[model samples]
Target: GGPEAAAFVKVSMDGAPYLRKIDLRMYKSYDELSNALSNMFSSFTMGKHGGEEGMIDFMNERKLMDLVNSWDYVPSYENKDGNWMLVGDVPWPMFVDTCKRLRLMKGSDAIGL
Candidate 1:
């Protein structure tokens, strides 16, 4: 059978007390997913809305100094290949196909932008 629209993935946020579950098929594009993320992690995320800016629209670091100074987090996922890659690197369908798990990581540890 083909991938199901019910495909549920686990979402883990760095330093958060609990994880969240989501069905990727519900989102046709990354922007759809982005809006959900902003709502879910509103308290912790930098931008007021429109997903986390670090991926689609990374602003100057000066604005993110707090997350940077502390343990900052960013979105990246583990593919079926078992490698961790940033989310925006591929097409939405490809991403939906390959992404096995989602993990919010330390922005400070990521090599360069």
Candidate 2:
């Protein structure tokens, strides 16, 4: 199997988090990706209607794809272990970069880079 990466990211508008980890090879266009995201967002259990009301509304009100396109990837840290830890923004490019780096360093079947 080939190496794959997952990107876990936090939204800017709110502190909501989203995990984006689709296989890019299958997506033919941005619309297709957005369609995938729409379906993915719908699965969440939030808002008054027990669905992704805020996110869905945000997508309608604003260009969801544009917001996604404008995402800035930064390496940040968390303080769970008493020290700052590195966390990568899981955009598609960043995910692939992380995975590739890990694969090269580890020389293993797979690694969470």
Candidate 3:
């Protein structure tokens, strides 16, 4: 085989790095992936980016997608089970910080245009 395949990505968080299985091949475009993440993290109130009550809308999804796309590298390696794992370099804290900024601006505190 030319190259091994991987489906999951490690998304680093504060306490511990969390592993989320993401089949990028399933997505036709970046927008599709964004929509997937919006649903994936929908249950978590802590990471809500924007919109009414921090809803995962198009705007918030795009913001998250943009940040993910900005990180240039997506490396693949083997796990203990002899399966490949995809690693994405996303600084979790910085991502959260940016989300907070976006959330605040889009929230009730900001001056509506």
Best by lDDT: 1
Q: List the residue pairs that clash in candidate 2.
A: 7-90
Give lDDT: candidate 3, residue 73: 27
Best-fitting candidate, scored by TM-score: 1
Of the pair 2 and 3, which is ahead by TM-score? Answer: 3
Steric collisions counted per model:
0, 1, 0
TM-score of 3: 0.29
Clashes of 3: 0
- Across 22-112, the per-residue lDDT of candidate 1 in tens digits comes to 7667666678777876576443433455335353233224225535664445568887887887778766777776756877664433322
Question: TM-scores of the models, in the given order?
Answer: 0.60, 0.28, 0.29
Clash-forming residue pairs, model 1:
none
Q: Which 10-residue span in candidate 2 carries the lowest summed lDDT?
A: 103-112
lDDT of each: 0.59, 0.34, 0.34
Instruction: Rank by lDDT, highest first.
Output: 1, 3, 2
